[PDB]
Amino acid sequence: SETFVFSKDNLAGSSSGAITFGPSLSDCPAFSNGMLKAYHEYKISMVILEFVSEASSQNSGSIAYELDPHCKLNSLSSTINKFGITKPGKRAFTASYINGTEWHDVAEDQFRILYKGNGSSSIAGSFRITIKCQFHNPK
Amino acid sequence: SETFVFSKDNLAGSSSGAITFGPSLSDCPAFSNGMLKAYHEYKISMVILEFVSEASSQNSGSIAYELDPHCKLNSLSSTINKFGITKPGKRAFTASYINGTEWHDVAEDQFRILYKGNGSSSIAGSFRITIKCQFHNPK
Amino acid sequence: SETFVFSKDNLAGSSSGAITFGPSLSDCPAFSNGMLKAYHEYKISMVILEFVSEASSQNSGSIAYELDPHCKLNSLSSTINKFGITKPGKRAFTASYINGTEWHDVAEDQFRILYKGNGSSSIAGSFRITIKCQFHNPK
Amino acid sequence: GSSETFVFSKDNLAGSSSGAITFGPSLSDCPAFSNGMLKAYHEYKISMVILEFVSEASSQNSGSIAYELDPHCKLNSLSSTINKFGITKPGKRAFTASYINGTEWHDVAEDQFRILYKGNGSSSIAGSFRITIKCQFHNPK
Amino acid sequence: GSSETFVFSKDNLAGSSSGAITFGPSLSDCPAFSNGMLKAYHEYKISMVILEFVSEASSQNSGSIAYELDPHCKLNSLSSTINKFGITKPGKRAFTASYINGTEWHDVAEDQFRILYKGNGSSSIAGSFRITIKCQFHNPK
Amino acid sequence: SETFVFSKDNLAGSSSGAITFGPSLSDCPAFSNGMLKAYHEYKISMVILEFVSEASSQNSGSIAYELDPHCKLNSLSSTINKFGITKPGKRAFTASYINGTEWHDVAEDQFRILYKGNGSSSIAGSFRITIKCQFHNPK
Amino acid sequence: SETFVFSKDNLAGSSSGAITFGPSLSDCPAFSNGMLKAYHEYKISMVILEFVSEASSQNSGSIAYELDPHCKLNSLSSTINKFGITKPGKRAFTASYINGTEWHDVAEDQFRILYKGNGSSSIAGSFRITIKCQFHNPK
């Protein structure tokens, strides 16, 4: 029942992107090219997403994050869940929310988080992702 | 968690078709055009399939139904389970039969019911479908 | 006992408008044209209104929201309940406050929330509305 | 208040004829209720309804009668066809208080609710609608 | 058959105003009976009548109200003045079956009997006529 | 929650009128011009209607009152309930009689009392009305 | 034991004034010209004073409020109790602090709150006053 922590920094206020959890997570060199390449099954039981506000209080906007459990969206569609870029935020996703009740092959993504900001080009903050995951069937 | 009740009517004695429970369920606008556009995941925990016999007692035949759990069949193949078009029928499908153990994205069809009758062209009856289902991760 | 979540974004600091809950709620495509069109009775038991502060700290003003339980006001009259545009806010309305103790026909509005801001034209934040409602007498 | 039980019947429901039964001051099928107690009390509520279809049709007639319950009298004809009775088999259905907006006392000039019926069979006789309404009255005039 | 008890009141009986109360299809003072049960049953009979005068007049008003019982509806106004109530004192009178022709079932289009009242006092308010009719009904429509 | 006590005086033996409990209750400035301009909703849970007999014992007649729950009658129609103008009277109306089960906007008249007397033109008495009522959703 | 809520808005950062509770409270049309004019005794048991910060974070200053229980000050004297104009504040005054243990005639003030700001002329925020009061001896 290991744990990983990584951070996507320098999130621009208007940058739109996707953080896919699986073989495509190049933002964490210790997960994509590490445990996955030497294992077969893995489930990401818990995802703690914490937005740390580096942005100046003079930046107007917000970062909306949409939690797609099947990687069937290439861009954000609903702007409901959002963090104000001026204040820190914390969010916890358990097993049921992120399709984390069954194993998956290390060649297939489990889920993704699509982030989209609508602020200025200045620095908006950082994303700290803590993934509590498990591995099975050692390779 | 909700209990959606809908129906398909004017099923002739020889009508052949498929009811795909998911985004293609145009029979019930309260499901395909409703909750499925307000959520990401859904699972159909129970399906109560009832056949109300509108047919005359002097008509012959029966309506067979196949419960395809993965929608790989586009037409009826097996006829082991059937309702006589002269007697009302009721059938219960729990989570295991209809792949309700796992959640699915609203762009994916969970399972389908292939229904085909062998009788004449007269009115055979109506299908009353009661899907007790849940939802998660609001859009 | 289903739940809906929707969001009215890009609330200008000086925009004045009304959010009516019922057939006129075009801000949520999954409620006005979804469940309501295929049901007869509905009561909105709980309304959680959360103001997320996207606005820069350089914006002076506030957004006053008035909860009219009979849709007899076309514009805000009392400026008591208000959110500072610089800080997040949360408010919970139970059954008694929003005339939510009896069913209503889907052709008639139940209540409305009139919002009025007195700040600058810049982005003031977003409104996140979580309506916990129930439906009865399937159509 | 006064508790009463009005049992009446709308007959000669052809398998193709459609209509609406409005409960309250427009209940022409039971003059004992529409023009009866409603002119002796200010407030009335229909706490319970028992709707029964007595099948007078023979086994050879194929069809059904679809009945829908409008609790606000804003529908003039049937729209959806979920609930239905077979024309060859007797049917029974019980509507409680919440289904028919019976939790609130109404002025006698208001129609509390209505039942819309529509047939999809032939033009012959299908059966009879036997309606039992258990009601309460308040504030005698 | 169905046994019912209809209690109603004709009010504002001035000490000088005279009139007639016809029991049956012309009982306008109690719409619960004239236009009520009479449209749900072919035959009705008024087994018992309790006629009471509630004296709302003060002791200073002098007079009386003379009431006569016509069991065949062939009288249009009071003729004799034997039975009477004092306007200052409450009065009670009980009419049994034979007095009001209540031994025979009548068609609902017929007036069973009537009570003619005539005052000989002043023009001020004298009291109220509270009428309780205990009746039976047969052959539901 | 409060217990407002007011009165209508100089009711002649033949005075005909209506007391509409709501914004049109000009008899008590503490109710129409007071709390009803500080709240949105109100319900009158109990009405104690007392008649104090100021009339001489040598005056005849009575005052009849009709408790219209929906204000559809603009004049007295029924006279089944009445107080003798020579004897003091008291009557109690609970929530069910006067439609107090539901709340109403302060621009709507809940119920009314139609009072009319048949006596002479002399002083008949006074109406003392005690409305035990509540309020909600302050303006 | 009724309750009132009112709000003094557009408090300038340098405005100095007094909020007197009684017949002189013209800021609340439902208290000065409502309940008081139709009653004799009244005591304001509790006063909840909440400062909502509408002011931009670029405004330097504070609003000092002094609670005079006998209306013997026409201007603020001590600057101890104060709210920062940049942040919300809440304060509760019980019966003993505001001379609220005995009734008073509706022609005499009970107490007053003297507010004085020393910031800029821009909008500094709003005052929300919730007075829980009681009335006696109906007029």
Place this chain on the structure above:
Amino acid sequence: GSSETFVFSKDNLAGSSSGAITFGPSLSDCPAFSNGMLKAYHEYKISMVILEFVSEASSQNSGSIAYELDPHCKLNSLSSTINKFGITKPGKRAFTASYINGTEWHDVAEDQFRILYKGNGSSSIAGSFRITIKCQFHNPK
């Protein structure tokens, strides 16, 4: 302190005459209290008042007497007409401590409270106001 009970009466209250009874140093109707104990004690409080109307008028006189309780002596005549007594029937009313500002000791030079009375009847005799005041005294002079 000393507890006392002063029972007095203001008589010849015509059905049309109106006035005010101020309790304390201006209670001219009971010289035993206004000029009595108040000159022997610094502090007095009127803990309880029993106000009774003895009806000496005949049944023929129609009217009422409206009495209002001013607990701060800032009213000079009657304004509202909620509480009232019928002139033909004896009346009783009990004012406790809080109603008459009797929870605080007062200097003898202050009027604790007053009762304003106004009649709406004829000019004949209506009755008598019998007032019982139960009071306490402190700090003897």
